[PDB]
Amino acid sequence: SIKIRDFGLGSDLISLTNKAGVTISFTNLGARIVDWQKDGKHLILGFDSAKEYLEKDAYPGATVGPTAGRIKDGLVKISGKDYILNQNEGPQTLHGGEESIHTKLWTYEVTDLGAEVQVKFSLVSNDGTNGYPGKIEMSVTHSFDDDNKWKIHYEAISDKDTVFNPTGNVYFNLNGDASESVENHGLRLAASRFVPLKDQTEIVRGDIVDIKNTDLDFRQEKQLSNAFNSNMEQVQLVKGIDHPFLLDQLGLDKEQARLTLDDTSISVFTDQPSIVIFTANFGDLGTLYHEKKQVHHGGITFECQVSPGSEQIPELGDISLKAGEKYQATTIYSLHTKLE
């Protein structure tokens, strides 16, 4: 079933319930996932109205871009030319600059295919918006099916050569409560390398580091507490994890990561080369979710995209988007429940 209701400020809340009784809900404010629940429990972090997102934290569950992550000095080179993007975190451009796409009301259309339902969100980024050449016509399709698969498919076309590398910013928390650390979750991740950060500004350090046999090796399932209790300088630096991990094998068919808590597990699939993992290292901030004060480590992201830092480490990839080329990306979050 599908239900649409007012979510505040003119935004809509679109709720999808599949054959299994699982409910997922989105908002056009930022083409974003708001909730995901099973047997009354929330699997992800989210607020109860549009206003909360705007007042508390506008990132959770949102489509972020045009470029996801931090860009050093807000500088990108396009067709050999330097362009300075909006700077919203010191001199860096984080998640596309201030008042970006995650804060706009996108238009949308719902398509019911029975076993699957799709919600197609659309937005036009005008040429020059926040320094980005365009216009960029963007669409994000969130779908949900009877096999409990939540899929995100991105598409874009630009009138001019530009840069494009968005991501989905959902935070998972299988405890179903923000006041509870994810340290008890088990994580598996098919990546042998990571991208260290230079310092507290969080720009990339410049190198690619092998993590095999370190507190960050999750090639083999492991509990989060291990990473959290590690003394690696990179962990210590951010007080948790806040880094890009480089996937060993690319392809949408491979399960790239798996998050588990008891009989409940989330599998991640993507066609992207990296996953940025951030463990809600907010200290005592205590943002409130459903009346519960969030704790440090009270959430974890799986941001699938081209790794941030390619401006300094070209090996990571290239986020350019040439005029007239069609950009496509797909990320899938699959939910499973262990039957005894």
Ligand X SMILES: OC[C@H]1O[C@H](O)[C@H](O)[C@@H](O)[C@@H]1O
CA distance 40 to 29: 24
Residue with tokens 């036009």: 124
3-state secondary structure of 314: helix
The window from 63-71, 99-107, 165-173, 201-209 that contacts its own copies (CB under 8 A) reads: 99-107
Considering the complex, what minimum distance in angstroms separates the CB of residue 98 from its own copies?
7
User: Which string of x and - marks every residue 6-45 that binds Na ion (by CB under 5 A)?
Assistant: ----x-x---------------------------------
Residue 52, phi then psi, degrees to nearest 5: -65, -40
Q: Does 65 bind ligand X (CB under 6 A)?
A: no
By rule CB under 5 A, what count of residues binds Na ion? 2
Helix (H) or strand (E) holding 209: strand 209-210
By rule CB under 6 A, what count of residues binds ligand X? 8
Q: Does 285 bind its own copies (CB under 8 A)?
A: no
Nearer CB in complex with its own copies: 97/166: 97
Q: How far is CA 194 from each of CA 206, 207, 217, 318, 323, rounded to the nearest angstrom?
A: 11, 9, 10, 17, 31
Considering only residues 38, 56, 104, 149, which one is a binding residue for its own copies as defined by CB under 8 A?
104
Check residue 237 and report its DSSP letter: H
Residue 115 in tokens: 């076993």
Considering only residues 279-338, where is the footprint of ligand X by CB under 6 A? 301, 303
Nearer CB in complex with its own copies: 50/335: 50
Cβ-proximal residues to 181 (8 Å cutoff; 6+ apart), any chain: 175, 295, 296, 297, 298
Q: Does 10 bind its own copies (CB under 8 A)?
A: yes
CA distance 326 to 320: 11
Considering only residues 33-92, where is the footprint of its own copies by CB under 8 A? 50, 86
Q: Which does 202 bind (CB under 5 to 8 A by kind): ligand X, Na ion, its own copies, none?
A: ligand X
Check residue 21 and report its DSSP letter: S
Considering only residues 1, 3, 9, 248, which one is a binding residue for its own copies as defined by CB under 8 A?
9
Nearer CB in complex with ligand X: 30/133: 30
Cβ-proximal residues to 112 (8 Å cutoff; 6+ apart), any chain: 2
CA distance 72 to 50: 31
Q: Does 272 bind ligand X (CB under 6 A)?
A: no
Footprint on this chain of its own copies (rule: CB under 8 A): 4, 6, 9-12, 28-29, 50, 86, 97-100, 103-109, 124, 126-132, 135
